[PDB]
Design a protein around this ligand. Structure first.
Ligand SMILES: COc1cn(-c2cccc(C(F)(F)F)c2)nc(-c2ccnn2-c2ccccc2)c1=O
Ligand SMILES: [Mg+2]
Ligand SMILES: [Zn+2]
Length: 315
């Protein structure tokens, strides 16, 4: 599988399509690993990584995504693409280290997800919960990523010094961690303060780290920024998963929260409207103020919000 991927070229008609934020990968399934390769070449160059090791990696990574309805291989590619799109529109912002790691981080950010939130894991005493007390799944995702690097001929970062090596793993570590929604609220709130007092400074490493955190979350949630038909269907995949976690609580005899209860299909529209207002819109709003080129995300997020309102009011 890994040998045939090196001989892949992206069809010319997509070269320009990919660059857009609202580009949907849904119909290009057997090309997804190629599209990732493509994204790394444009974003770094062919000289950056060793092609042989890079292909083994993407296939291993692919292998360890599970057949869950939403936290799967399609979602990893979708998220990676959004990060690509961000980086290409902010070419001057990031160091060579950041560009590389961040794409890797996005690809691996939900490795070996089982379909369960941190709550369900910390509630019913899962082994992972015993190991990882905070950011449970997120620390595991990083475990998985490190273990895949350490396989034979999978270490894509071979050609870097000790110093450069542990820098990029720290970037990847904190990035993947920042994908937990619990930390987004703090992070985002700290960044609004620093922008409106004008104390934000990207020379400051801890300020850079906060921004990258927000970029992760913006990328993670980017399915709310696609065109309406795609966003609509991606929602069905999210709730299928929410509802399966809820049916694991019903099996014991417990009513889950309304979000995870399939008896309340009828409230999904309102659930979305709530989620856009409290989470999605402030995310892209704050991202845009720090990185104006990412305005198209905010625009798209707004358009879908309207659409859910029309649904709510019966149109
Ligand atoms: C009500 O609809 C939705 C609720 N959540 C959500 C998720 C967790 C916690 C909470 C908390 F805020 F309730 F804590 C809300 N996430 C999404 C969503 C849209 C895109 N990715 N994504 C997502 C993000 C993370 C996990 C699953 C899905 C969503 O559409
Ligand atoms: Mg995750
Ligand atoms: Zn994710």
């Amino acid at each position: 599988e890994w040998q045939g991927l090196m001989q892949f070229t992206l069809p010319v008609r997509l070269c320009k399509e990919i660059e857009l934020f609202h580009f949907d990968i849904g119909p290009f399934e057997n090309m997804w690993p190629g599209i990732f390769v493509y994204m790394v070449h444009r974003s770094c160059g062919t000289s950056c990584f060793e092609l042989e090791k890079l292909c083994r990696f993407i296939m291993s990574v692919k292998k360890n995504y599970r057949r869950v309805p939403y936290h799967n291989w399609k979602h990893a590619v979708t998220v990676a693409h959004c990060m690509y799109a961000i980086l290409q529109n902010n070419h001057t912002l990031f160091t060579d280290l950041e560009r590389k790691g961040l794409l890797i981080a996005c690809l691996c950010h939900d490795l070996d997800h089982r379909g369960f939130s941190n709550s369900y894991l910390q509630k019913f005493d899962h082994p992972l919960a015993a190991l990882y007390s905070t950011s449970t799944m997120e620390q595991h995702h990083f475990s998985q990523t490190v273990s895949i690097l350490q396989l034979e001929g999978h270490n894509i970062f071979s050609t870097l010094s000790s110093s450069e090596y542990e820098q990029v793993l720290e970037i990847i570590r904190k990035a993947i961690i920042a994908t937990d929604l619990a930390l987004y609220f703090g992070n985002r709130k700290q960044l609004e303060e620093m922008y409106q007092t004008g104390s934000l400074n990207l020379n400051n490493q801890s300020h850079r780290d906060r921004v990258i955190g927000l970029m992760m979350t913006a990328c993670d949630l980017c399915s709310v920024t696609k065109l309406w038909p795609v966003t609509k269907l991606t929602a069905n995949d999210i709730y299928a998963e929410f509802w399966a976690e809820g049916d694991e609580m019903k099996k014991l005899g417990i009513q889950p929260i309304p979000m995870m209860d399939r008896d309340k299909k009828d409230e999904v529209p309102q659930g979305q409207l709530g989620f856009y207002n409290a989470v999605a819109i402030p995310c892209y709003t704050t991202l845009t103020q720090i990185l104006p080129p990412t305005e198209p995300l905010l625009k798209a997020c707004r358009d879908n919000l309207s659409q859910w309102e029309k649904v709510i009011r019966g149109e």
